[PDB]
Design a protein around this ligand. Structure first.
Ligand SMILES: Nc1nc2c(ncn2[C@@H]2O[C@H](COP(=O)(O)OP(=O)(O)O)[C@@H](O)[C@H]2O)c(=O)[nH]1
Length: 293
């Protein structure tokens, strides 16, 4: 979000040591914030509410009567950013037995996140099992098999054209025999939504009943990323989100509009291509970081 932070810390910086600014120094800065949000590809409705929330909250803080208005703005923009990102952190509820679907498009970081998610929980005392659920592309299963060997987590590859009921049986037996307590199913990912695959997807969810359905979204595809969320949600049912490639995220509209566009919380974030690159999402932390704090 290099760009956004830079210009945002600027607009704020453009107020220090000025004393009590008027409703014209303000009006100036707010638009600046609005333009910053736009050049970051933030949803236009989010951008509107955001700017409004800053006008509203700042006046409530008598910015016009403050002797340090830059600290008020910084403060309201901070909360506006924390809210937009999701507010307080959120992590799936870890039960005794967990079966989660990782869904998304090919290249979203979905296969890699399934293996990072496994690695993450393994270090948390969980006993995961990776499941490569693509019944049409051996290579896709193969990719997860290698990813799994590298993070030291077992991988079950479904068979070509294998039925959900079959998959269920095999996964549960391996889970049983290996005391797996966190099951991660990397579903089929394609360059674009496939109606038939969506059907096989919903069906698979129907047979296996995951407690969580996490949609993996590449943060670098801006506003587009979220347009794919409504389809998955509609035809399958998403419980949370994972925003990958935040470390390559120039701009940042995706992450900032996600909670508004999707209505789902971001549990995890991809912050490096490294195995440990995946971490729980902290809206508060990301907000403070954007404002340089
Ligand atoms: N820098 C960075 N790279 C990532 C992140 N998540 C995934 N990747 C990389 O993005 C590419 C796409 O991953 P994935 O969708 O799993 O693979 P594909 O389906 O085979 O294209 C891989 O090269 C991953 O290493 C992330 O958070 N940061």
């Amino acid at each position: 979000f290099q760009q956004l932070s830079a210009r945002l810390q600027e607009a704020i910086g453009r107020l220090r040591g000025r004393g009590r600014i008027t409703e014209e120094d303000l009006k100036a800065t707010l638009r600046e914030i609005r333009r910053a949000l736009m050049d970051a590809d933030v949803n236009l409705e989010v951008t509107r509410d955001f700017v409004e929330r800053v006008r509203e909250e700042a006046l409530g803080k008598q910015v016009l009567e403050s002797l340090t208005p830059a600290e008020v703005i910084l403060a309201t923009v901070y909360e506006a950013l924390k809210e937009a990102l999701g507010g307080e952190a959120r992590l799936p509820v870890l039960k005794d037995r967990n079966l989660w679907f990782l869904v998304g498009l090919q290249g979203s970081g979905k296969t890699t996140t399934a293996a990072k998610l496994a690695l993450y929980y393994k270090g948390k005392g969980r006993r995961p099992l990776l499941v490569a659920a693509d019944t049409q592309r051996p290579a896709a299963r193969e990719q997860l098999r290698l990813l799994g060997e590298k993070v030291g987590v077992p991988v079950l590859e479904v068979m070509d054209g294998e039925s959900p009921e079959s998959i269920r049986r095999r996964v549960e037996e391996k889970a049983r025999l290996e005391a797996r307590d966190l099951i991660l199913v990397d579903t089929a990912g394609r360059l674009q939504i496939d109606e038939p695959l969506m059907g096989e997807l919903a069906r698979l969810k129907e047979v296996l009943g995951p407690d969580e359905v996490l949609l993996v979204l590449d943060a670098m595809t801006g506003q587009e990323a979220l347009s794919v969320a409504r389809a998955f949600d509609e035809k399958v049912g998403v419980t949370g989100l994972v925003l990958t490639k935040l470390d390559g995220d120039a701009r940042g509209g995706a992450a900032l509009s996600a909670r508004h566009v999707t209505g789902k919380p971001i549990y995890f974030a991809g912050v490096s291509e490294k195995p440990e690159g995946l971490e729980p999402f902290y809206p508060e932390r990301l907000a403070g970081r954007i404002l340089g704090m």
